[model samples]
Target: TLNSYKMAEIMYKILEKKGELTLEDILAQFEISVPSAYNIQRALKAICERHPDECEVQYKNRKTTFKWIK
Candidate 1:
């Protein structure tokens, strides 16, 4: 889906601005089906991978989050 591609950027931009974001935070923006959300989540991780030096992905207390090390 194009959203998976675009939303990844959206997630990253939010990270750039907010410094940290949870999967829930971005997902809370434009709700999608669980199936689509699954793919989008993977896309988000790919985005983080592209910026490996800045983004740190973590899972704590059942929450998936990305922290920007800026």
Candidate 2:
């Protein structure tokens, strides 16, 4: 099990890469499943909303995207 912040960071990286990541991509790099990735994405969504200025997560086409502001 992982905490929300860690999951958020993983999501940030996935989105930062321009939503080019697939379930297998994350699974290959990390010990998470497709469902886990989805859960992480959900966590990132909440975190991003709570700290909009600090979070880099974005969404479009029902998918998440992230960008580095700094």
Candidate 3:
């Protein structure tokens, strides 16, 4: 989905609740490909840059990880 806004909306809720997300999770949960998942990861990284108060993005354990907040 090109609508990063909508994707953020959905992911924000999940991240705020689940507290984390990985590319692989997006691949399976969102039924997207590896490249698509990376796109989502890119979207999320940009989102984090724009909305630092909302969440932070991390690349840990050789994977892209999203954390809602401290």
Candidate 4:
């Protein structure tokens, strides 16, 4: 029963360990629907907004990237 916040939190932990990840990589790790994936992405964006010094979301060459900054 994972909600968007929990999913984003888990993704934060993963980025902490992996350093960075593509959106595709994140999607592959979950069994959620496409819409739910967008929800989790939004949640992650919110996390970045709340902690700009610690994490961020970036886009390049049509790819979305998430990273833990500290």
Candidate 5:
């Protein structure tokens, strides 16, 4: 069973490779539920909090989309 941090790392790699991703993108790629996708988003936020210089998360379209800023 993967933990939140592991899931976060997976998300980081996906964003790094894809340049950006929407919630639907993650859902399609990982075959996860909507709520699980949001959980991954939360993990990503925690990661951004830990590494302030490495990356950041931005919300747009009234929180419908999330982008990773490097």
Candidate 6:
């Protein structure tokens, strides 16, 4: 099984490529269905929450977004 640290790193790469990505983007790009996507999103959300000064996960109009807290 893969770890969330690796997954989050990959997700960060995806964000770097697009400058932003929604949950749907992650789900589609990773070929994960809704429930799996939701799980990952929740994990990522927790990471974001725990490290609010390091990174941020946001949403606009119901779409998720990520940005480094620089």
Which model scores highest in lDDT?
Answer: 4
- Sorting all predicted structures by TM-score, with the top scorer first, yields 4, 1, 3, 5, 6, 2
Better candidate by lDDT, 1 or 2: 1
Q: Judged by lDDT relative to the true structure, which candidate is superior, 3 or 6? A: 3
Question: How accurate locally, in lDDT, is each candidate?
Answer: 0.77, 0.60, 0.74, 0.80, 0.71, 0.69
Query: How many clashes would you count in candidate 6?
Result: 0
**TM-scores of all models?**
0.77, 0.52, 0.76, 0.79, 0.71, 0.63
Cα lDDT tens digits for candidate 6, 4-26: 55666677656656666567876
- How well is each residue in 1-70 modelled by candidate 5, as lDDT tens digits? 5476787788777876776666777678788888888887778777767775656566665564445566
Q: Model 4 residue 19 lDDT?
A: 85
Q: Which segments of model 1 are wrong by more than 4 Å?
A: none
What's the TM for model 3? 0.76
Query: Using alpha carbons, what is the TM-score of model 6?
Result: 0.63
On the 0 to 100 scale, the lDDT of residue 56 in model 3 is 81
Which ranges in model 5 have alpha carbons more than 4 Å from their true place?
64-68
Question: RMSD in angstroms, all models?
Answer: 1.9, 3.9, 2.1, 1.8, 2.2, 2.7
Q: Report how far off residue 64 is in candidate 1 (Å).
A: 1.8
Q: What is the per-residue lDDT of model 2 for residues 1-70, given as tens digits with 9 covering 90 to 100?
A: 6785686677666555554444445556667778876676666667567666655555668755554553
Question: Which pairs clash in the backbone of model 4?
Answer: none
On TM-score, the stronger of 2 and 6 is: 6
- Where does the lowest 10-residue lDDT sum fall in candidate 5? 59-68
